[PDB]
Amino acid sequence: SFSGYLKLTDNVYIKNADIVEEAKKVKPTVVVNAANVYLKHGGGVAGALNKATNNAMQVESDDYIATNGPLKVGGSCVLSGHNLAKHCLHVVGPNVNKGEDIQLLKSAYENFNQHEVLLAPLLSAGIFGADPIHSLRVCVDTVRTNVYLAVFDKNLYDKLVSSFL
């Protein structure tokens, strides 16, 4: 199972780790992708997860978009986890670098409640522009299922743990 995580609450755990390396190691039931509405996995966590699947995630995602259309900001879809997990829960957090409503971050985290256990990044953090400290607070106040957060940056991981209320 998940190893080396710091317990933040009854159900939220955190580790300084590369979510791709974490997914290949654990092969969890669910890995969360920091997706955009178009499922265009170009950069950040999405680009890294997609590159690990040798682009199979993008091929599957384009077929999903052709059939269903784009996701909503705050929404999600369950697709294959490929070589990383059983499933990938593609969750769209608001991208503040596109003027998207930061209040949608709670709706985005509510998608995690449909899965008993997940390996996940902090939603809307990184290239999505939101404050990662705010994202972690929304995560612990919204997610009731068991969430194992992988934070790539060591310096951000330390700031998140040392400032956690």
HEC string of 43-77?
Answer: CHHHHHHHHHCCCHHHHHHHHHHHHHCCCCCCCEE
Backbone phi, then psi, for 65, in 5-degree steps?
-65, -40
- HSE, side-chain direction, 13 A CA sphere, residue 104: 18
Distances (CA, A) of 160 to 76, 100, 122, 150: 25, 23, 11, 12
- Residue 59: how many other CB atoms lie within 10 Å: 13
Strand order in the sheet with 12-16: 6-7, 12-16, 146-151, 117-120, 30-34, 87-91, 76-80
Q: 3-state DSSP call for residue 130? A: coil
Q: Which of 42, 127, 118, 121 is nearest to 81 (CA)?
A: 118
Q: 3-state DSSP call for residue 118? A: strand
Please give the structure tokens belonging to residue 89: 């829960």
Q: How was this structure determined?
A: X-ray
Q: Using an 8 Å Cβ cutoff, are 119 and 148 in contact?
A: yes
Q: Which of 141, 142, 143, 121 is nearest to 132 (CA)?
A: 121
Pairing of strands 76-80, 87-91: antiparallel
3-state helix vs strand vs coil in the chain, percent to 5: 40, 20, 40
Resolution rounded to one decimal, in angstroms: 1.1
